[PDB]
Amino acid sequence: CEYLHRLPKDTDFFNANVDCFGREKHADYRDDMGGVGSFLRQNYTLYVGGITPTDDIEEIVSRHFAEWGDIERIRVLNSRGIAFITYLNEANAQFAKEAMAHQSLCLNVRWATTDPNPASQARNQ
RNA sequence: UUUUUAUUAAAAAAUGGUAUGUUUUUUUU
Ligand SMILES: [Zn+2]
């Protein structure tokens, strides 16, 4: 093949326009947050949704996500099957997004929305 | 005083006839 079959590592920066996964990044960031991020905003966390079996959702998603890259933050909603793993790098984040879609933990993986938390926005900034 | 010749056209759409307007959520602390 003409593309790397290995996993992104820490220093694998790419140009801002190009998606780190080889695709191209638009500007509108879509409406359903589906395919590829926007070069106008820099986010590393992605919505993953789907099964809500039991209380061990945190550990199952941690096991099923840490093997895709380096993790900075994980927040899982207990009431509903929603998790918001935050990755350290764009490369690992987008690789995980394209690797955890329609998989078994089907997962409804999307891009995260702007935080409404006045406290979370401050620490993110 | 014998014979004539002269030949337009012409089908389709909208008016016009099963109006129209509405309509599904990822974080707060
Ligand atoms: Zn390949």
Side-chain angles (χ1 to χ4, degrees):
Chain A
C1 182
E2 263 291 357
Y3 298 98
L4 321 165
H5 271 169
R6 55 103 163 170
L7 185 80
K9 44 180 51 63
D10 184 80
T11 75
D12 273 341
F13 64 93
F14 298 107
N15 310 320
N17 67 7
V18 65
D19 186 74
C20 61
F21 185 70
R23 293 182 183 174
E24 207 275 348
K25 302 168 35 174
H26 294 88
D28 296 325
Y29 189 46
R30 285 204 96 166
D31 297 79
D32 73 80
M33 306 288 150
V36 160
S38 178
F39 56 82
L40 282 197
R41 94 182 312 290
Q42 182 80 300
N43 51 3
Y44 304 89
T45 190
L46 61 93
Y47 161 76
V48 64
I51 190 64
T52 181
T54 47
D55 186 44
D56 57 358
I57 56 175
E58 286 77 30
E59 62 78 10
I60 60 173
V61 304
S62 170
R63 186 176 54 263
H64 291 110
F65 284 167
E67 68 92 14
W68 292 128
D70 172 80
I71 311 171
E72 182 268 300
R73 183 174 296 269
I74 294 176
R75 194 186 184 290
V76 189
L77 276 299
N78 307 319
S79 55
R80 51 225 179 278
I82 284 187
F84 287 13
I85 184 170
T86 309
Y87 265 88
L88 170 79
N89 300 326
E90 288 293 329
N92 305 314
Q94 298 179 174
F95 199 106
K97 175 180 184 331
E98 287 297 332
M100 272 287 117
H102 309 313
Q103 301 278 35
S104 48
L105 187 153
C106 74
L107 299 151
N108 176 40
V109 179
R110 286 300 195 279
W111 280 111
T113 300
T114 312
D115 292 332
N117 304 357
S120 190
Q121 291 161 281
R123 45 173 209 87
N124 286 356
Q125 193 271 336

